[PDB]
Amino acid sequence: LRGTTQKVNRIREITAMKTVEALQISAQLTQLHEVDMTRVAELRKKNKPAFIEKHGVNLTYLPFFVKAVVEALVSHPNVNASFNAKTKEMTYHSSVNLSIAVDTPAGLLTPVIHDAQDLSIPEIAKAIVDLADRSRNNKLKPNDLSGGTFTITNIGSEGALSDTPILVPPQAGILGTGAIVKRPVVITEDGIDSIAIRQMVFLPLTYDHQVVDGADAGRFLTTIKDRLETANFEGDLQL
Amino acid sequence: SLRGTTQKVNRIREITAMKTVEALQISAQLTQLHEVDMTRVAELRKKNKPAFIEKHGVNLTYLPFFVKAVVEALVSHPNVNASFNAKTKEMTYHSSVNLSIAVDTPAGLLTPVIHDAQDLSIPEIAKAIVDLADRSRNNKLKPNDLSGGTFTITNIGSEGALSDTPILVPPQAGILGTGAIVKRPVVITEDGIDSIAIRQMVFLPLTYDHQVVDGADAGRFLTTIKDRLETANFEGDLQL
Amino acid sequence: GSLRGTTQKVNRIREITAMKTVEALQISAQLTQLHEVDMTRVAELRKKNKPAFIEKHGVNLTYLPFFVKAVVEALVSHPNVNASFNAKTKEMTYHSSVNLSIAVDTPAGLLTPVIHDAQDLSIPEIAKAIVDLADRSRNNKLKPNDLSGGTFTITNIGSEGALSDTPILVPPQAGILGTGAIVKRPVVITEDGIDSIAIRQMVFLPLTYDHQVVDGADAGRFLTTIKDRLETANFEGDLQL
């Protein structure tokens, strides 16, 4: 590539145009919360063999993030929404159509899990495997890329703690899952503080201030954080 | 429930949507982040809270400490308490510090203003915050309570956030977020010896307009705030 | 004179900075990815070799030549980051030269002088070039060539205490890296499968990048190359002592 000028492909041309425009037709800002993933990590380590044996797919952290985010989009319908700046009307989507960022040799794509609110953790794990595979092997259909109401992007896959991901209207939010890192943190029990090692992650949420304010974003991220930290997912694994 | 419907938004949401989209296009916003050790303020607040409530008739929270430090820094850094005219290329440095504070209401977030905040003590700030929060919730704010802001503080930690990139509204040049105050293991140095101690740490993200403030100006302004809060010499300021 | 209570026209640097930064955000798609880097081994190497470095090369050894050397090597191995996008023709230009801009403080404001063809320079040559550019910036001895042709920028946001920032990128550049404050922190260390807590010098490296040129995965790969180079800290030979 070095020392050359080359025309970009259609996917990269559209990405360049849409991201420049997206920032000018929305009011983006990125709120950041930290989440203790230790209990999810222990649950995943304990149940991974039985999960793979019963459902036929590997159990990663992604279905836990997806389950929590989709439940929070149902509980906070104001975030699963779109604003029309010409009519000043807000549309609150009944479907949670979750876009996921996927890496392909031709560029990043955002295929969609339609009606993700009806899916269990085993169904989510299978849908991720299917979308990632077809995205990398050029087997996506136009329906796989349209209708998204919210996006999740795994920025931690290449080592980042956090980012300010660009949302694409008509969506109102895009959540990044940063790298999960062991850190010394403070634990409080019966008013006594102590230092312990925990698996911590940053969850940066880019949100559109036309649709969501700082308090709305914080309540939505708190629902996600508390669901993941409690890690009451054994029943959800359907073992 | 809201799901499956299309609804016209209220006047606050409509103006907020319009102003925030436009604000980002008539300024050059970026957010610098510093960490501040609030342990000494936390201990001072815990020790003096009963005497403060008894004398001044108001609860002592962290907010008057953040307000007092930010307003002192806006006086010491008049270049931050300022507005830029992009047509004439002139900067106006405001002699008044009119501090806007983000407040929650049933109809949405508002930013009422503490006018001439540079003349106020911590007890006067605590009383002004109680008055503004009460009238904001009970729909008794007047137009003079919402105009003339020269800088804003928003408590993004009230809903759990560590940090954010809050949107600044021109003609203001800065908006400071106060993140959640969290106990963390940190390195302390005493008599040349490093050790690990538990401290109450907060992130202070400052969104600033690069038309008015550069990265070094922002850093010097946040350092004045950080040093004031970390030294926590506020006992005389409490007027007990 | 005193600013408070006055209206004053800004100087040329502030006027150009106000125009370029407002416009830059509207002709690019900026976002800032953040990574943490353990600078302890670089700090120890710098402390150990600082006297021999200033004795042989005549200039002080700071952290900046280490950041510059790592960033310039990564700009050569990630040519997609040392690049510019033409939104009219939809063509990407991958620059063969690494012309590294560095933010410098002056009495009149911040400037970004450029180290041209930085890919050919050693750490001693980088250290000498930084001293020269910082001096000529503060004493108004810069020639127009010292401010043009930049392909990437490094800004030391940690010099005034910041952990991180979302620095504004100036097109046609595709990235700007901030070096946050280097702070001692308790971190987890793993040795033979055993975790322990140790004190390490940690730094945040926020990279603002243009999504027209670089995506989140590209940014992460580029920052991982820089992070691994700095954490390994195999720079003794590079110091040419």
From Swiss-Prot, chain B:
The active site is at H210, D214. Signal peptide: none annotated. Disruption phenotype: Cells lacking this gene display no ODH and no PDH activities. Is the only lipoylated protein in C.glutamicum. Belongs to the 2-oxoacid dehydrogenase family. Forms a 24-polypeptide structural core with octahedral symmetry. Part of an unusual ODH/PDH supercomplex, consisting of AceE (E1), AceF (E2), and Lpd (E3) together with OdhA (E1+E2). Is essential for both 2-oxoglutarate dehydrogenase (ODH) and pyruvate dehydrogenase (PDH) activities, but AceF has exclusively transacetylase (and no transsuccinylase) activity. The lipoyl residues required for ODH activity are likely provided by AceF. This is Dihydrolipoyllysine-residue acetyltransferase component of pyruvate dehydrogenase complex. It comes from Corynebacterium glutamicum (strain ATCC 13032 / DSM 20300 / JCM 1318 / BCRC 11384 / CCUG 27702 / LMG 3730 / NBRC 12168 / NCIMB 10025 / NRRL B-2784 / 534). The gene is aceF. The chain holds residues 437 to 675 of 675 of the full protein.
